[PDB]
Each structure stands twice: as structure tokens, then as C-alpha cells.
Amino acid sequence: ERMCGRMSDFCREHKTTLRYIIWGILIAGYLALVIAACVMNFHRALPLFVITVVAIFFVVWDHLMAKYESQIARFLSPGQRLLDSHWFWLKWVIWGCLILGVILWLVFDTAKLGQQQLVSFGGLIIYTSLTFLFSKHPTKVYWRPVFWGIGLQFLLGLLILRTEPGFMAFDWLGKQVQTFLGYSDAGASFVFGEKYTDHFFAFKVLPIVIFFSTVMSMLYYLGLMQWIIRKVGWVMLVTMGTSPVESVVASGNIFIGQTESPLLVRPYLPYVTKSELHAIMTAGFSTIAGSVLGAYISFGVSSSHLLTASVMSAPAALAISKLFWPETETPKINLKNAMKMESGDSRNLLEAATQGASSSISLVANIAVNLIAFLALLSFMNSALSWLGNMFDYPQLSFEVICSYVFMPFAFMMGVDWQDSFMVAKLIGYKTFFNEFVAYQQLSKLISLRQVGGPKFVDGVQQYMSMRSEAISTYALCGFANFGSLGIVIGGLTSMAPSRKRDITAGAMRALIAGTIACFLTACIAGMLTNTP
Amino acid sequence: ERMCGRMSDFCREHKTTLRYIIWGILIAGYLALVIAACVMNFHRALPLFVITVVAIFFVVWDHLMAKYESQIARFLSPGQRLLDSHWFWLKWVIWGCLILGVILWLVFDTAKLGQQQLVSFGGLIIYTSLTFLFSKHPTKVYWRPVFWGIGLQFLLGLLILRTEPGFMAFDWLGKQVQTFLGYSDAGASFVFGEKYTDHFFAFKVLPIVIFFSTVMSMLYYLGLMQWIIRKVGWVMLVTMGTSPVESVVASGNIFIGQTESPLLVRPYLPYVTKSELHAIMTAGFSTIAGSVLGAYISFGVSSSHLLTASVMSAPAALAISKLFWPETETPKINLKNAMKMESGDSRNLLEAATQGASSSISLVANIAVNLIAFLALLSFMNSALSWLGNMFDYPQLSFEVICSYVFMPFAFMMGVDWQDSFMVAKLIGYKTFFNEFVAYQQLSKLISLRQVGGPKFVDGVQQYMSMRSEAISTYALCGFANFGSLGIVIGGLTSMAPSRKRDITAGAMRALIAGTIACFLTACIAGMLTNTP
Amino acid sequence: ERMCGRMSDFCREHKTTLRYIIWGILIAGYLALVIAACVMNFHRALPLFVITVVAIFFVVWDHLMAKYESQIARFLSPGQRLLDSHWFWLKWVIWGCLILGVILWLVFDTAKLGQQQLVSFGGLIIYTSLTFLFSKHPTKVYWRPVFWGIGLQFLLGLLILRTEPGFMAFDWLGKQVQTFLGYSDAGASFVFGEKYTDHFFAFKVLPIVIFFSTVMSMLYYLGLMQWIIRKVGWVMLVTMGTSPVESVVASGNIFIGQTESPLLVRPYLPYVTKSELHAIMTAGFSTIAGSVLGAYISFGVSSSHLLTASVMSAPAALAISKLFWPETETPKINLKNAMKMESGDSRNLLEAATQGASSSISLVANIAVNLIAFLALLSFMNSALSWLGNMFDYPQLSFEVICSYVFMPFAFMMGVDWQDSFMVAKLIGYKTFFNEFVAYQQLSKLISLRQVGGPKFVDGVQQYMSMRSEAISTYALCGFANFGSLGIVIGGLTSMAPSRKRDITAGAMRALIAGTIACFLTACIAGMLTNTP
Ligand code: NA
Ligand code: NA
Ligand code: NA
Ligand code: NA
Ligand code: NA
Ligand code: NA
């Protein structure tokens, strides 16, 4: 077997050059396809060219930053020193300019829009003040992250809701997701037949969850998700001054569920502080996961609003966490350790697809059973309350009626008008007591009723509300914060870090309340930027 | 933050009074609602008043018993001493009076009813005698629990089946359950659509199981179930002289499944005797769980009979266990340890609801798969037996035909007439070899056929049987005793107590046989008290 | 209790004779039934008589072999010594006779059949040569198992495909399975109603899997499966000279899945060599399980071909494993240890049925979810490729089109004609990238189209292929070898033997490739023996 030994020696001697040459050939082939497509027709091949250009730009950028980091830092150092020298007097100028800009924006846009937008701004202030007053350590508050998070939310809102470029970008992004969720029908039609639409939720909506989980697992294998997470976390870390671990988890929670996002920093969990743990749980509670987005879109909820709320929730979560539970210890973990995310044990892409599919079994099972139980309990509670109410000649008593009054002030402060605040309060109650699936289903009912065009009042009962109120409700309801998920959150986090069971239990309720407040802050900003139609 | 420190000091100083005052205010509000409801209209508000009155009575009673236990015991002591002094001669008088009462009841009621009721009494005697003859320790039998359990069963039967108050109470109780199981349709209609009735069992019956498990978990969180269990267990403990642990488990098994009832005494399992372990498994085998009651009611089985059998099974289970495997050791566990039931790890009611829902996934999955497998095996076995029978010009050979002859004597001794005994034997076979779901389905078929009113015989084949036989079959079939559940019982009990694996395996088969005998004793009593229509 | 003591003493004294007498009485009863059935009518009772005769023959045979093993070995020893003495010159004569027979068979049958059969033979040679060239240890090859496995495959093919007795036997065997899979409808119709056919796959096909798993568990309890396994493994061990452990696992994999077949030798796994581990994984990858056979038959795939391929796969798997990874160590485990198969923990048959049913839950769940995900991914990939292809005026680009060219040479070497090779390549791609369920579904589509009789070409697109190509595809696709099952195989095998994790990972990919090659060798033989219609 002399030839085999020669082949093995040749392979060993120049292993690095052989695989690099192969990869170069593949890249050259892809570029040849792109250039030929552009040559044959450019307008038809434009999106492929755009994708290739942006990918090349990002690759070159990352290589340069990795290679020339020291030189760039040294080059930037002098300006930082000069700014540090003049900051003692320049801080007042910068702060005054920012305050003046806020006042001008209010006077010349928010007042023009109407009273409800000003009420949204007031509600923003009031929620922040209530967070401060009931803070764990009111005297230890570091105010930089709070203002920076609120400012980042405002800037994202201006970019996406008040500019044609961002509005178009996110409408397009939402439309792509709607196209993407239709591919699951191919599998649903085989497994459950051409009559799979006879059972819409079970045989059409849950397969969307399965498919989305599969795709997310594939993307995690390929390493794209970690790349986006690192970028967003770096932005939040450099502006708000938050710790690397909580920034990474907050950025990750945009795409990943509360129970799986801490796995990004699993090794370092035992050494995190109390504040970072609170921030982790709050970020978990203030966001949703990319596996359940398609279901909410299938109900009829706006995709663009869901994506915008998911993006805006992270800085809100971090600001509210730092205000509610500020840092009184010294963090141990550093940036390099936090940013490295131990990938899963998948040898190839198809194994990642199978692992993503298998994990989705319990998710859909629990979703279905929880919905069954919650809706049966709702029916029983309404029947019991009607039974009790009839003893006072008020058989209309219901869970919805009580929630329409209990939660109305929260909706009013978010900028919802007087009439529609009572309807939004019912959705808040549904989310608080059962979950966000039920609330989004009811919101989809209201949206469909509005879209039909029927009467707005029948026998004195309002049937549907305005579109602005629907957007505000979409922002308010985007989260996994409910009283029933406290146990699963605590259990999973203890499983990852058994030593910290005592600390985890202490901060969980405060974290849930903070997540709710963060969703309401996102809703307040959306309300103050949207106009009355 | 001086105000916050003042608030914290105020909260700490008078924590006990603050929460007590809050609870008092809530109670006052509830009482105000009740009294106002009665004032506006009394006949309409009667049930609420009754519920409030009984709750108040039980609260006051428990407080008094807890506070004045020593004084009451001291007050009762003299009479116990006097009775002990005169018992050597008074025991004969009491026993003779009881025997005379039994003879009179037989002569003046059972003989009047007919021959079948006397046969039911004879079958009671015969089953007890067979239990004694094949006993583990025939010379170590303590006869007090045996007679006390049979007497308690007879008294419950007289109260519920032979008095208007008890008959009405349990008919009302059964009717409430039927109303309760209808609430699951709200969730089933959403998850599975308005066509969920196209698949009746899977999309309408199993959701009932899910909902009932959820409600049972909520009740276990609230502590009501343990309260009822403690009351019933105390009655059985004080009359039959049984050990606290087995009394608690027997009372618990009325509501809870065999695999979960031992968790009530999980810490103390390693130290129980062989007899107590046998009693635990027997109680597990002689009863059903509150999660699967609604399914049997949905089939068409009488709710009142199911509840009555579930209540009557516990003293029967304990009597048969003590007769089959009497106690030859010294029990270690005491009343206080047995009565304390470590509650689950649920922080609030909604978490208990979610935990109850999640646990139901495996239950319904196993139910469905087991039914599929058992019914396919039944079809294959019947086809094979027809194939074999045709070789003797008897292609009618079947599992049902063989069981109609094998188990007929057991049904005859329970008081079923000659014609219907062969039909009841088939149900006994179904329960023995596959499970009680299959048997109750077949019984529901027979009940529906009777209710239609069609011919009782077609081509010489009896189509349905009498109502008394249906009741007797309902009592006989109420249990989880089948050859296939021995493994899961043993596995779970070893998991709770690994050290006792050797003892658990030894007594499991005897426990299964005892459970079957207990169900047959309940059926014998029901037969001797019911009349022929 | 003197009588009970006397009974216990009587039972203890003559325990062996009592149970032997009882078993003898049962046997006498069975024989009486058989003889009476024959007396009443013989032609009607023939199959029962045949079954009884073969069972008696095998029982007597096994008893004699167990009792007289030493005498038979001593009696055979002289002839073995004489053959060993004359072998140095007799080996050339035997080898020349075999080569001459092969040449004659080719010339007088394969050439008569046509060119495609000769191409099948050439493909057999080419696959073997490629296996040798890329072997782990090309200089350490032991050639006896390779030739013996290929010869055993050829002999089985001649017996089953080219003789009336074997063809009839396996057609009958296939027809019995079709009858057997119909019994699951009884359970499916109850659990899912009379409309269970509205959802064919989920409510009719998976119940077949459940039922088959139940039956396999029952047979494993009874010990029949181990008996057949031992016979086949002994044949392969004595002819091919393979190690006992790998022979037992290869024979077991005919009936049992890859993830459960190693449990037959679980205790001895830590001490197996690298080659035996590779052979175990290869045997796992080259076969299917008896639980999923009914689903493929339900699609419309030939039962006889599936059974024949499953039988032929084992010697192919062992030959390809020994050629790809030959043995360079000393095996430790012996025949007695390998042949003993620790049975499961089931106390009775019905417990085995319940355990078989419960295990099937995860199997069907994973099957369904994996199919959903794979088919949605296929739709997305096809849409993306059409989007890319339209940039070159080729919107017909698809996964099927690419696979029709990538895998065509493999199909051509198996003897598929030029036109149908492109269609078989698509099935090979489906199996390689997703799994064998998808591939068999597509093959069933093609078979149904052929059976209808419509046009073979519409608008220049071939709709269906010949029957010989369908058989070749049936043989090629019979295996669990796909890139996504590597992880589950590795995980389970590490779980059974944690110490060997390093060795398991090394050989898994080579094992998967070997399994694919083994399926292709079975297909090559089938192609060279089948005729063109
Ligand atoms: Na999240
Ligand atoms: Na949010
Ligand atoms: Na029970
Ligand atoms: Na019972
Ligand atoms: Na296999
Ligand atoms: Na194969």
C-alpha cells in the first residue's frame, strides 16, 4: 500500500493549503454565478448582488477589526483623553442640548399629534418613577443605562415608525416571515392530510412552531445567530455600560426563549452577581422567541410591530432591571468569556435540523395542553361569576368586566383613549393571568372585526377599537411574563446553576414585574410616536 | 431613603397584625356580599348561604378540636375506663344484638326482595371465606378491621341506596360532575376546532382528563384534598384499628391514582411493614382516580354509582388486605407523621394549574396507545380463534365466548341472575386482561342498547341486560387491577423506596387479587341492597 | 392450620413433578385438539398440523443438540482432520470449481437476460473494489467473510427469486403481514373514530407502528425472536468466520432497530474491538426494524422485496464491514456469552404488551415531526433554487434535478437502465439527505402511477419507470443510513458504553458509508437476477 502511504503523506504535509484552495474554488464558483446572473439581466439579479455585497463587506470588516484592533484603539486613545479632559464642563452642554431637543420634539410633533401622545410620554415618566420609588437600592442607582436605554428605544422608534427607509425595511422583513411560515404546509398536508385545515390550530399552526425551531437550530449551528447577537450586545454594552453577560443575554433573548437564552453563558452563571441574575430573568420575561412568532402572525397580529417590539424590548429590559435592582457588587466575568458561546453538539446541518425538530415536541405539547386548561378554567370562572352576579341582578359579571376596570389605568397611561382603554385592559388581564397566546388570539378577533367594517357599537357594546390601540396592545403583550412561568424559569435556572437556588428565587418576582414594566415602556414610546387616524 | 427605612421598620414591627387585619377585611367583604344577596332575595341565594354556613362550622370545629384536644380527651377518659371495666361481659350483648339485627334485616328485607339478593349475601360470605383460607398467615388474623370494614360498607350502602337524603345527595353530586366536565369543550373547540366532535374520544374525552388533572392539582395546592383525606382516614383509623399510614393511603386512593397516592407518605415508606405495603398496593388496585372519572361518565356510566363505589372501596380494600396479609410486626410510624402530607412545590395557584396540565400529557398518551394496542390484539385473537374453531364446525369461538363461561361463577355469586351472568363475565374478562376503559366502553354500549328500547333477543342472542346487573357491573369494574399494571406499580414504588424492592415484588400479585376481591365485595353489597325492577 | 402446612409440605416435596405433569396435560390437550381437527377434516386442518409438526421437530432437534453435543463433535472430528490434511491441494480444486460455476452462470443466464444484468454484476465488482481501495487497513484484509457473504447473498437470491418454492414462500409471508397490519384499524377506529381515514398517515399508519412494536415486545418476552436470531447468527458465524458478537448483532438487526439491537450484547460492549464496533454500527445502518415495515407496506411497497432485502442485508453488512475495517486485534468475548440475551423485566405477556405500546410513543412522535420538518425544508429549498435558477432563464432548477445527475452513476452501476437511472437517483437523494420514509413515499407514488396505466411520458417528462427498477430501488432504499441519524446512534451507543465514546465517534461515518454500500450490493444482486419484462 505504498500509494496509500504517499497519499497520506501528501495530505498531511499540505493540509492547510489543500482545504484553503478548495474553499477558494467554491467562492470563485459562487462569484461566477453571481456575475453571470448580473450580466444576463441586472434588475432581475439585484437582490443576489446586494446580499453578496453586504456579506463581503461584513467579512472584510470583521477581519480588519480582528487584525488591527490594537492600532485602532491606540489611534482612538488621544481623542478619548481630550474628551475626558474637557468633560467636566462639556457634560452640561451636551445634557442641555439633549433636554432642549426633547422639549422641541414634544412641542412641535407630540402636541401636534394630540393629547394621547402626550399622555403616552407622561406614562413613560410615571412608570420610570414608580420603578425608582420601589427600587431595591434607591440610593445605589447608576443612571447612565436607564437614560441610554430609553434613548435607544426612542431612536429605534423614530427610525422604524417615522422614516420611510426603516418603515419599508421592516414591512419587507415582516412580509418575508409570512412567506416563510407557509412552507410548513407541505409537511402538515402529508402528516395530517388535505383535511389538515379542519383543525386549524393543531394541524396548521403548531407545525409552524416546529419548522421555526428547526430553522433556528440550523442557524445556531451555522453561527449566524451568535454573530448578530454579538453585534447588538456590543452596541448595548458600549452605550449603556452594562456588564457583558447581561448584555449578551439581553441581545440573545430577542431571538431565543427565556429558558434557553441563559445557555449562552452557562459556564459563567455560578459567578454572576444578583443584579446580573435579575437582569437575565427580566430579559427573559420581556421578550418572546422566534419559534412562536409565526403563530402570532398566523392569528393576524402585525409582523412589523412584533419585530419592532422584540428589538425595542432589550434596552428597556436592561434599563428597568438596572433601575429596579442596581449593582452593588463587582462583576467577575469579562467580555471575551461572555461573547464566546459554546455551540451545540451537532456534527452537521441535518443533525441540527433533527435536533431542532425533536425539541419542538414538548413545546407544542405544553402549548396545547396549557391552552386547553386555561380556556376551560376561564369558562368555569365566568359561569361561577354569572351565578354569583345574578344574586344582585347583575348576571353580566365576568372576568372580562372586572379586568376592564382593574387594568384600565395602565392602558390609559400608555396613551390609549378613554373608550379603548377598557378593551385593552381585558387583554392585559388575559396576558397577566393565563399567557400571551390567549391575549393575542383575542386581539386577532378584534383586528378581524375592525377589518370587516361592521358596526362599531351593537346594543351599546363596543365591538372593535382603533388601529393605534391595536399597535399599542401589540407592543404591551409581547412577552412571556405571567405568574405561571415563574416556576419553570426558576427550575431551569437552578438546574443550570444549582448553587444559586437561594438567589434565583429571591429576584424572580421582581424580574417578572420589571419585564411587564419594560413591555409597557415600549408601548408608551410606540403610542407617543404613532398618529391618530 | 429615610421614608423607605421607616416603611420597612413599620412593616417589620407589626407584620402579624397587618396581614391579619387584611384577611379580616377580606372576610368581612365576603360576608357583606352574602348577607346582601340574602337580603335582596333569599331563595335565590340559598346555596351560597349553605356553603358559607358549612365552611364556618368546619373552621370553628377544627379550631376547637386543635385548641381543646387535651380537655376533651380527659373528659372522655372516664367513660372509656368504665366501658373497659364492663366490656368482658358487655361484648357478648353487643355482638348478639348485631347478629340479631343482621338476621332480621335479611328475613324482612332481603328475602322480600328476592333470591338474587340472598345470593349476593352468600357471595359476600364466600369471598370472605376464600380470602381467609388462602391467607398468608391464617393463624395471625385480627378480625376487628374485617368486620368493621364490611359494616362500614353496609352502612354507606344503606345511607346512599336506601334513604331519600343520601340518594338525593349523591344524585346531585353526580349531576354536578356532568356539568363540570362540559367546560373542557371550550379549550377543545379552539385547539381542535369546531370539528373536534369528528374524533370524539381523542379530541373531546381526553381533554376532560386534562382538565380534571388540572383541577385536582389546584385543589392539592389549596389543601382541601388533604383535609377531606384526613377526616376519612381518621374515621377508618378509629373504627377499624388500622395503622395511620395505610388508613391515609386508603382514604387518599379514593381521589388519587395508585401511582401517586403513596407520595402522601413518601418519607415514611422505607420503614413500613410488609402488611402496610400490601395494604397500600391493594388500596391502589381497588380504586380509580378523579382524573379518569369524567371519561367513564362521558361513556354513559352512572356517576352516582361510580362515586359510591369509589367511597365504598377503601374499607373493603383495608379489610381484605388485613385478612389476606395480617400484621405480624410492630408498626413504627405514628399518627402525626402520617397525617402530615408534604405539599408540592407550587408558588401560586396558576403554577399548580400548569403543573397539573403538563403531567396529564403522558397519562393521555399512554391511555390512547394502550387502547389502540389492546383492541388490535383483541381483533387478532378473535380472528385466530375463529380460524381454529372452524376446524370443529364452530367458527363462533371467541374471547368473549370463553370468558362468558370462565368468569360466570364470580358474577353469579355477586347476585346477577343466570341469564345476565354470562354477559357480566365478558366485562370481567375485559377488565382482567386489558383494563377498565375497555370494559366500561362495552358496558356503555349495553346501557345505550337498553335505553333505546329495541328487542332484548335477536336470533337467540341477548342484546342487553337489566339495570340492576348494570349497577353490579359498575361496582365490580371500578378499579385499576389488571395484570399489565403490576410492572408500573412495582417500578414506581421501588423508585420511591429503593431499599424495599424485595418486599414490594413479593406482595404485588396478592395485592392485585385482593383488590379484585374488594371490588367484588362492594358489588355484592350493592346487589343485596338493590331491588329487581 | 395443619392442613395448610401439609399442603405446603406436599407442594415443596414434589414441586418438579407437579408442574411437569401440568405441562404434560396441557400438551396432551393441544395434541387432542389437533388430532380431532384432522379427523373431522384433514384438508381444512392442514396448516395447524404443519405448524405442530415443525414445532415438534425443532423442539426435538434442539434437545438432541443440547444433550449430544460432545458425541456429535467427536464423531465429526475425524473428517475435519482428514479435510485439514488434504486441504493444501484441495483448496485449488474447490476454488476453481466455484469460479467455473460463476462463469457458466454468467454466460448461460445473465447474458441471456440482457446487458443490464451484466452491468449489475460489474457494479457488484466495482463497489467491492472501491470498498477495498479506501479500506482502513488494506493490508490486513481477511477475505473469507467477504466472499462468503457475497455467496450467501447470491444463494438467497437464487432460492427466493429464481425458484418456485422460495418465491411462493416469501409471497405468502408477505401476504400474511398485509393481513396482520389490518388489525390496528380496530383500535384506530375507536380512538380516532370512523373518520380516522380523513387523516390517513397520522390516524391509520402510525397505529400500525404501535401494534407492531407491541407484538415485537411480546415475542421478545416469549423468547422466539432470540431463537431465530441464534440460528441465523450461528449460520453466519460458522460460514464467514465472524466474531460471535457481531454475528449476533447482525442477525438481530434483521428484526430490531439500530438503537435497540446492541442491547442484545449490552454487558460485553465495553470489551469489543474497534472492528466489531464498526460492524455493529454498519449492521445498524444497513437494515430496518420490524416496527416500521407495515408503514412501508401501507404505502404500497412490495412486502416480499422488503423481507428479502432485510434478510440479505446482514451478510452484506458483515462483508462490507470486514473489508472496510478489518480486524487487527484479538476478540475477547466468546460464543456462549454472546448468544445469551438478557431478556427484559416483564413479569407476564400483558405487561410486555403495555411496555411495547408505551415505547412506541416517542417513535411515532419523532417520525411525524421529522417528516414535517424535512418536507417543509424541501419546499423552501425548491423555492429558493427556482428563485436562483430564474436568473439564468432556468426556473426548473430543483433538488430533484440536481440529485438526478449527482447520484445517477450509482443507480446505473446497480443495473438500472439509462432512462430510469435518473429517476432512481432522486430516490437515492431523498434517502441520503432526509430519510427512507420520504423515499418510500415517492416510490409508492411512482408505483401507483405505473399501476394506473396512464401515459409514460407527458410533455417529455417520464412519469413512471419499469417494475425491475422499482425492485432495485426497494432493495437500495432499505436502511436507516442518513446523515441525521449519526448523532442519535453515537449518543445511544455511548450511553450503553460510556468508556468507548472516543472509539464510537471515529468509526460512525465509515459505518454509515458501509451500510449504504451494503444496500447497493443487495440491489446489484437483485438486479442481476431479475429479468426485463
Ligand atoms: Na426571549
Ligand atoms: Na417585549
Ligand atoms: Na386510586
Ligand atoms: Na373499587
Ligand atoms: Na436494523
Ligand atoms: Na438493507
Side-chain angles (χ1 to χ4, degrees), chain C residues 62 78 212 245 314 423 501:
Chain C
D62 288 354
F212 277 32
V245 162
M423 310 183 69
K501 176 173 178 179

Side-chain angles (χ1 to χ4, degrees), chain A residues 16-19 21-66 68-73 75-80 82-83 85-179:
Chain A
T16 49
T17 67
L18 174 59
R19 182 149 292 281
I21 280 174
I22 293 173
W23 284 117
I25 293 172
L26 262 56
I27 294 170
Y30 173 79
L31 295 179
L33 293 176
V34 174
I35 185 173
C38 293
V39 165
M40 298 186 65
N41 185 336
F42 194 91
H43 180 64
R44 188 174 54 188
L46 190 68
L48 182 63
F49 179 75
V50 174
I51 297 169
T52 307
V53 169
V54 302
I56 293 168
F57 168 84
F58 276 119
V59 171
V60 175
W61 169 272
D62 288 354
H63 165 74
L64 292 178
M65 306 324 277
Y68 299 87
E69 187 178 358
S70 63
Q71 310 184 12
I72 296 171
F75 170 75
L76 294 183
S77 174
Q80 178 57 26
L82 190 68
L83 293 176
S85 302
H86 290 60
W87 169 255
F88 72 93
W89 70 267
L90 186 54
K91 75 185 193 176
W92 300 105
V93 182
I94 294 175
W95 294 348
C97 289
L98 293 168
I99 294 173
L100 181 65
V102 170
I103 291 169
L104 294 175
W105 180 266
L106 293 171
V107 167
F108 293 104
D109 186 314
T110 313
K112 274 55 174 168
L113 262 47
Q115 183 211 272
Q116 314 313 327
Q117 296 69 359
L118 294 168
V119 175
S120 300
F121 177 73
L124 185 143
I125 285 164
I126 282 163
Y127 283 117
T128 303
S129 305
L130 290 175
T131 317
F132 172 66
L133 180 63
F134 290 91
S135 182
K136 188 91 173 180
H137 299 109
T139 55
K140 305 294 120 194
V141 171
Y142 183 39
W143 284 101
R144 177 190 177 191
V146 181
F147 287 123
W148 260 110
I150 294 171
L152 289 177
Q153 280 191 105
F154 187 70
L155 291 173
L156 287 161
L158 288 175
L159 192 76
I160 296 165
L161 306 175
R162 305 245 65 190
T163 59
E164 291 180 5
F167 186 98
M168 283 181 166
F170 270 67
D171 182 57
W172 180 89
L173 219 53
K175 282 172 181 170
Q176 298 309 300
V177 178
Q178 292 172 2
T179 296

